[PDB]
Subunit: 184 residues, 3 copies
Amino acid sequence: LYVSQGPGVDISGDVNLTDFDKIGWPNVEAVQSYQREFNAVSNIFDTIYPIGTIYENAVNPNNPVTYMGFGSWKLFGQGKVLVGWNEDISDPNFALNNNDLDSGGNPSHTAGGTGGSTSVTLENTNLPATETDEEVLIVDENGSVIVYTKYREAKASTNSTHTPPTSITNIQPYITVYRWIRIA
Amino acid sequence: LYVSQGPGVDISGDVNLTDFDKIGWPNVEAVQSYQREFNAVSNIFDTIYPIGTIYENAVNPNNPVTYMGFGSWKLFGQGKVLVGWNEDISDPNFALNNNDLDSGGNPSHTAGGTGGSTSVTLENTNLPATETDEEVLIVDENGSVIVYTKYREAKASTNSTHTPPTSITNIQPYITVYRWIRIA
Amino acid sequence: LYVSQGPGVDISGDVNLTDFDKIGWPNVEAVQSYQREFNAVSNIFDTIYPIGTIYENAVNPNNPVTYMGFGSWKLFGQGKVLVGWNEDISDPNFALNNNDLDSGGNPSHTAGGTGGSTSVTLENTNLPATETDEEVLIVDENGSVIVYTKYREAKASTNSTHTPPTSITNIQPYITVYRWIRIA
Ligand SMILES: O=[P-]([O-])[O-]
Ligand SMILES: [Br-]
C-alpha cells in the first residue's frame, strides 16, 4: 500500500532569506500563509528541513544537496558553538542580536547574535587582592619603624616582563562537525 | 508512481513526557512497543522527529508547527550549549543529572544535567605561587640582617582595592539559534 | 491521494564509514554516484538522515532505531560540544583534524578535530605584571638608601603553598542531550 498525502497543512510561519551572502536578520522575510500538500517527496522534505534549518554531519564534507537530493545549503557557524536563543530579553549574551542593530545601535531580539573568545589574556584588573606571605618593610608616613648593597624605596614588581602574559584557553571539550543552514 | 508504506516498524523505545512545564527526567515515561505503519505523512514525521527531538533553525522565530505542520514544540536550552551525554559515569560534568536526584540527593545517569558559567571571577585560591622580581627586606626571626618616612613591618598588599576584581568571559565563540524540543 | 515518488535524485556525494569502532576520517570513503528512487519510506529516511547525520534527543535514552525504525546509530561526541568545522584553514582550532594526521604528522582539513578543556589551572606564565600597593625597601646595587627580629634579603613569596592552585571552570552554560551519529 501507499503513503497517503493526508490533509494538507497551513504553513503560516515560514520565512525566506533576502541576503544569501551575509545570512540572518535583518535580511529575513515572513512568507504569507500557504497550503502545503504532500504531492511528492520534495514537499515532505520541505516540512522536515524548512528554510533556516541547521543540519550537521560528522563526516560527509559535501554539500547536503549532493547526498539528500533537495534544498540549497551553506556552511553555518564555522568555528562556533550554537547557543539557544533566549526569549528572556534580560539574558546579556544570548537574547539580543549584535549583528542586527537599529538606527540607535540597539540590537534586535532575534537569533543570530555572536560573541565569545577562544582565549583570555589576564590583565591586572582581573586579579584579586593578594599579600606577601611574610612581613616586609613598607614605607609608611604613619610608621613607627625607623630605618653590600644599598636599597631603593619603590613598589616591588612581580612578573614585570609579562607584557603580555601567556593566554589561557577558553574552549571547552569539542568535536567539529560539518554544519549547514538551508538557505532556499 | 507512489511511495510504498513499506513494512511497518516496531517502535519499542519511544518515550512520552509527563510534565510539559519543567521538562525532562524524572518526568519521562517509556511507551510500550507498538507498530508504526506509514499510513500518511504524519507517521513519517513521527519517525523523523520523535518526541524529544531537538530541532534548530537559525532565522525562523516561529513555533515549528507553523512551518512544518506537525508536532508540539517548546523552546529548549535557552542560553545553553548542548553537550553530549556521556554513557561513562565517571564523567564529572556530563553523565549525571543534577536536575534529577533520588531521595539521597544522588543524580540519575540521564541526559538533562545542567551547569557552567558565563564568566569567572578569580579568587586568591586560584592564583599560583609568585615572588617579587627583586629581593626585598623580609622579617625573619632566623634572619641575619639587622635593621623622610618611617616604615612599618607588615605583609605588603597588591591590588587591595580589587574586591572583587573584574570578571573574565567564560564563553567560547558562538552564534545563537532558535532551538526547540518536540514535546508531543 | 498518495505521495508521488517524484523524480529520483542523483546521490553523488554520499559517504560510508570504514571503521565503526573509532569513527571518522581517515576511515571514510566516498560512494560512487547512484540514483535514489523513493520507493518506500526507508528511502525517504535515507534522504533525511544520511550516513554521518547527527541526531539529538533531550530525553529518550534508547538507540534511535528503536523509536525511528531505521538506521544504525552510535553515541557521538560524548562530553563534547559541537563546533562548526571551518573551511578557512587558518582557523587554529576548528579547521584541521588532529585525529587524522599524515605521515609527517600534519592534520587533514576535515571535520572531527577535537580539543578543549573542562578547567584551567593558572600558572605564573599566565599572570600579568603587578606591583605592591605601597613602596617597600628593595635591594639595589644602584640604590641610594643605606640600611625584635632580624631580616633577610630575599624575593618575597605570595601564595607559596598554592602548588597547585585551585582550578577554574572552563565550561559555559550547558544542558546535556543524547547525541547520536548514523553510522550505516
Ligand atoms: O598578585 P599576584 O602578582 O601574585
Ligand atoms: Br569556556
